[PDB]
């Protein structure tokens, strides 16, 4: 009912223009790990967790595609 | 004393047994030849005019039926009636019973009497029972009730309105009512 | 050959040897019928 918005105001909100430095900080962390090749230390539990978050943002992209074509089931044309 | 207390439910039950033949109005066959006559009394004496009344009614009805050619068979529930009737009426006699009066009559007594009336090979075309209907501590009256055979109840016209009726259910009902009327007579004659 | 015929064949022996014998004859008949079907097809 109304608890969904109670949580969404925390986590389902656009990122404020103040926290993008921390976003690119985490991005530079992960690209440093890719540069050194140290991602082998990440035990596969956290690797699976990161893969799940990646599929989550990929589903976000796909919901963007389905809202950007004004149709749910495939391309209406 | 106690019999006047045990009579009320016995009266209700016995008269409820005979409510059918009163509502359906079974009239009995006035053309048949075989007749059964049960007389209810006790084994004890000093009763006054009980056994004398029962014997007088049994003798009168035996005479009235034999005058019409009907072959009568007699039954006496009690030793007094058998003793009073055995001399003058010995050829006309089927079964007698004993040990009545010392203990109050129960439905076991009636079930017995009915059984040994049915396992006798005497298919009676009709019957009567003679007892002493109790009216008050001073007054009683020798009354008589009918006993219909299977063919009387089955061949009656007014029995056409009754349902799921065949010869088997009528046989069972007639046997149970023989027991019921014997029990009713036994409960009325002990007062 | 251990724990197979210990858990699969010992309990089923009284049934596979004496009780289901006519069942085995019927299975032979069924295989014969299925083969005669799949032949003419």
């Amino acid at each position: 009912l109304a608890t969904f918005w109670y949580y969404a105001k925390v986590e389902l909100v656009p990122p404020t223009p103040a926290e993008i430095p921390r976003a690119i900080q985490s991005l530079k962390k992960i690209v440093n790990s890719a540069q050194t090749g140290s991602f082998k230390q990440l035990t596969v539990k956290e690797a699976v967790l990161n893969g799940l978050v990646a599929t989550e943002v990929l589903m976000w992209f796909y919901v963007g595609e389905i809202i950007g074509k004004r149709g749910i089931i495939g391309y209406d044309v | 004393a106690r019999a006047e207390r045990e009579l009320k439910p016995a009266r209700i039950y016995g008269l409820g047994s005979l409510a059918l033949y009163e509502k359906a109005d079974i009239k009995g066959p006035e053309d048949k030849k075989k007749h059964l006559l049960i007389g209810v009394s006790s084994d004890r004496g000093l009763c006054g005019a009980i056994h004398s009344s029962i014997a007088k009614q049994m003798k009168s009805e035996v005479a009235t039926l034999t005058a019409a050619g009907k072959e009568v068979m007699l039954v006496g529930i009690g030793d007094k009636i058998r003793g009073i009737l055995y001399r003058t009426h010995s050829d006309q006699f089927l079964v007698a019973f004993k040990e009545v009066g010392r203990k109050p009559p129960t439905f076991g007594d009636a079930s017995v009497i009915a059984l040994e009336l049915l396992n006798s090979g005497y298919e009676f075309d009709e019957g009567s029972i003679i007892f002493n209907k109790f009216r008050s501590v001073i007054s009683y009256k020798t009354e008589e009730k009918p006993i219909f055979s299977l063919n009387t109840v089955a061949s009656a016209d007014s029995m056409s309105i009754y349902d799921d009726i065949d010869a088997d259910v009528l046989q069972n009902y007639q046997e149970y009512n023989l027991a019921n009327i014997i029990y009713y007579s036994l409960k009325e004659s002990t007062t | 050959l251990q724990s197979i015929i210990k858990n699969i064949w010992i309990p089923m022996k009284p049934y596979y040897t004496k009780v289901y014998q006519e069942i085995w004859i019927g299975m032979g008949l069924m295989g014969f019928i299925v083969y005669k079907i799949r032949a003419a097809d």
Binding site: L42, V44, K45, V48, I73, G74 | - | -
Partner: protein, 74 residues
């Protein structure tokens, strides 16, 4: 066990024999059974999860017939 190990030789270290994979499936079955079914005051969810995985497996092999009833064309 996995979710803790980070070595690819583990993939070779495992017993890929008939008895090996048989014991693996049996261990998984007994783990599931003891976690969800082999408990007093148990739930129906321990069976509904199996039924849901079975419906997924059923939709898997029926996709080769279900891709011929596609609504769109792309």
């Amino acid at each position: 066990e996995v979710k803790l190990g980070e070595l690819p030789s583990w993939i070779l270290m495992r017993d890929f024999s008939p008895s090996g994979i048989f014991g693996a499936f049996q261990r998984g079955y007994y783990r599931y059974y003891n976690k969800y079914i082999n408990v007093k005051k148990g739930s129906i969810s321990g069976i509904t999860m199996v039924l849901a995985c079975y419906v997924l497996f059923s939709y898997s092999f029926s996709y080769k017939h279900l891709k011929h009833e596609r609504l769109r064309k792309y």
